[PDB]
C-alpha cells in the first residue's frame, strides 16, 4: 500500500488492519448513498444494514464480511476497540452480504463523544467452515479473528465517518 492510501490516511490500516492489496470489489450502500473512504453519514441514514456487494467471478468462492467500530465508545478514548457491528460469512462471490450467513446481526451505529469510523472488511475464505459468534461485541480483534479462521488478509475494505446528530 502507498503511504497515502486512503485507508492509512484513515488509520484503518494501523488501528484495525495491516497493509494488503485489494483483490475484490466491495460496494457498501445505504439507500442510494454509496460509501466512499472517509465519507460522513448521519446515524439516522445507517440504522439498518447496508446493501453490500462483493465482487469475484466464482460463486464457489465464499467471503466473510466484518464491520467494526475502532473508536468505541469515543475516538478520544476507544477502550472497547473494536466494536463488532455486523458479521456475515459464506457469501458467494458475485453476490451480496444478504446472500450470506449472518453470524452477528447488524447493530445500528450510535456514535457519541466525537467522530467514529465504521469499517467494513472483506475476507476470502479458504473454503467452507463453521464460524462461531463472539460471546460479546466489545474488544473484538479483526486480526485475531482472521487468524483464528484462516481468512488470511483483507481483499477489500472501506470506511465511513459518523457522529451524534447535532
Amino acid at each position: 500500500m502507498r503511504d497515502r492510501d486512503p485507508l492509512v490516511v484513515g488509520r484503518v490500516v494501523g488501528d484495525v488492519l495491516d497493509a494488503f492489496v485489494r483483490s475484490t470489489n466491495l460496494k457498501v450502500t445505504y439507500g442510494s448513498k454509496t460509501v466512499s473512504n472517509g465519507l460522513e453519514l448521519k446515524p439516522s441514514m445507517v440504522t439498518h444494514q447496508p446493501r453490500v456487494e462483493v465482487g469475484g467471478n466464482d460463486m464457489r468462492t465464499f467471503y466473510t464480511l466484518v464491520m467494526v467500530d475502532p473508536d468505541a465508545p469515543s475516538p478520544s478514548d476507544p477502550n472497547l476497540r473494536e466494536y463488532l457491528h455486523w458479521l456475515v460469512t459464506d457469501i458467494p462471490g458475485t453476490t451480496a452480504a444478504s446472500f450470506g450467513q449472518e453470524v452477528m446481526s447488524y447493530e445500528s451505529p450510535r456514535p457519541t463523544m466525537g467522530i467514529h469510523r465504521l469499517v467494513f472488511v472483506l475476507f476470502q475464505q479458504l473454503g467452507r467452515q463453521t464460524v462461531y459468534a463472539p460471546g460479546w461485541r466489545q474488544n473484538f480483534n479483526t486480526k485475531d479473528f482472521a487468524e483464528l479462521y484462516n481468512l488470511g488478509s483483507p481483499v477489500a475494505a472501506v470506511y465511513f465517518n459518523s457522529q451524534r446528530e447535532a
Binding site: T29, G31, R51, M59, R60, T94, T95, S98, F99, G127
Partner: protein, 235 residues
Amino acid sequence: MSREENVYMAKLAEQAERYEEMVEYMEKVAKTVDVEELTVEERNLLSVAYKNVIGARRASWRIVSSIEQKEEGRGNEEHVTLIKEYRGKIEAELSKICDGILKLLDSHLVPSSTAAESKVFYLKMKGDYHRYLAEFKTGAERKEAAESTMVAYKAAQDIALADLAPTHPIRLGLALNFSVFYYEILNSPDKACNLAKQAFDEAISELDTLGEESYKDSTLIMQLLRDNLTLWTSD
C-alpha cells in the same frame, strides 16, 4: 420428410429467424415419434421455437397494453377503442400459440416422459404457457390459468426435488420460473424471493462438487436467480 430432415429444416429456420416455421417443423418431430421421447437436442429446439414465437407477441402485448392505459388516463376514448381491438388481435395470437404447445404437451410430450429430467422439463414448460395465458387473461380465465400454472410447477417441483440435483439447470430453471410466477402473477414478492433464494442456496451448497462444464451450465441459471433476487430486493 425424414426426421433428421425436419430437425434440419427446424435448424435452417432458426437461422433465418423464421420462428413459426421452426415451430412447424419441430412439431412434426414431436408428433412423429410416439411415447418415444425427443432427444435433448430436439427437446431444446422445440422449446426455443415456441419461446421465440410467443416472445415476440408478449413484447408486442406489453407495449400495446402500456399505451392502452396511458391513453385511458388521458381519456382519449376514440384511441382507446382502436387500441383495444388491436390488443384483442394480439391476444388471439397468444392464445393460439399457447394452445398449440399446451395440446402437444398433454397428448405427447408429458405423458411420453419416462425420466425425471423430461418430466420436469415438460411440466415446467406447461407451467410456462399457462403462465403466459395468465399474463394477459383477466378475472376468471386468469385465475384458471394461474391454477393450472401452480399445479404444473408444483408437480415439476416435487419431481425435481425427488430426483434432480439442486444444481441441475432444469431444476434451477424450474425454480426460476416458479418464482417469477409468484412475483408477476400472484403478486407475492416474499414468496417469490423465498422460493428463488431456497433454490439458489441449495445449489450453492453443491456448486463445487461439479466438473467444469457442469458448473458453467448451473451458473448460467444461478446468475438469473441471483439478479432477480437482487432486483426484487433493491432500494
